[PDB]
């Protein structure tokens, strides 16, 4: 799984810790290994959530399954949760796509996982 | 919605209030609230289109619905004027990928818009 | 065609005409004219894989077509290649997300490829 938040926080509002505690919360929702994990920050962009610059931020997550309805409830409680409390962002200028990716479609060490 | 773009043209090229336009053309062009639409810009990137560094830009718009053939046309030549008025990025060197997203697999507030 | 490789390898790591040589491999290997094909590195990125910080890479290949499994075995095998003798990172510390786009999803000159 890949999780990948753009925001326009400032580099100095991300804690320490911030993508070691993402790797972790992410292997425990999704079932996945943490070495399976892969997490990016992108902080002090340039953005705008319904007009406004307060922060926000935009995301997604890709997986080989593992994304539905049910699911993705959970992972965006999960993860806007964590953005509100280490990033100070409302949850109500989240958005976060999800990325339900067939095994044939991620390349990874050569191959696929097809 | 939400619509980003990255390009090579530098920061200080990117004119002010270049956000808000985008905002405000694209709630009109989707016929969603303000409230709803996200723009991200990110400029001075390492790109090329066509092997050529000359000013160019990825871009990408998601939306729940609202998203077809010839809305995307008419997306296109929106956001091709703005690019090419604005950021004087010329509208053959635009690329600009369109995503149907489900409702299911869009997070926001918590929870997902299903 | 459009790359897209975001990595924590920091800009002087990433070698002059790097972008060129991605541009010329991707035009041989999915049989399109160079002028097609844009490419972008992002480097000094904030992301962790496997909760690791060592070298690694988040990447997207899109295109029209020319996305399958036997192709995008032949895809990652290449740009694991390219990224490992370029950039320093072991092939698996990279992902590549496939996506076969509909030419009615892609804007460019102001209007769609459909």
Same mark, same amino acid.
């Given at each position: =799984?890949?999780? &990948?938040?753009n925001?326009?926080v @400032?580099?100095?509002?991300?804690?320490?810790?911030?993508? $070691? +505690?993402?790797? /972790?919360?992410?292997?425990?929702?999704?079932?996945?290994? =943490?070495?399976? &994990?892969?997490?990016?920050?992108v @902080?002090?962009?340039?953005?705008a959530?319904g007009?406004? $610059? +307060?922060?926000? /931020?935009?995301?997604?997550?890709?997986?080989?399954?593992?994304?539905g309805?049910?699911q993705?409830?959970?992972?965006?409680?999960?993860?806007?949760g964590?953005?509100?409390?280490?990033?100070?962002?409302?949850?109500?200028?989240?958005?976060?796509?999800?990325?339900?990716?067939?095994?044939?479609?991620?390349?990874?060490?050569?191959?696929?996982?097809?």
């Amino acid at each position: =799984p890949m999780f &990948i938040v753009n925001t326009n926080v @400032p580099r100095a509002s991300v804690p320490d810790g911030f993508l $070691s +505690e993402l790797t /972790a919360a992410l292997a425990q929702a999704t079932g996945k290994p =943490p070495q399976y &994990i892969a997490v990016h920050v992108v @902080p002090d962009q340039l953005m705008a959530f319904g007009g406004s $610059s +307060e922060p926000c /931020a935009l995301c997604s997550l890709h997986s080989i399954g593992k994304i539905g309805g049910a699911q993705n409830r959970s992972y965006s409680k999960l993860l806007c949760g964590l953005l509100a409390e280490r990033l100070r962002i409302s949850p109500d200028r989240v958005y976060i796509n999800y990325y339900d990716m067939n095994a044939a479609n991620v390349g990874w060490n050569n191959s696929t996982f097809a």
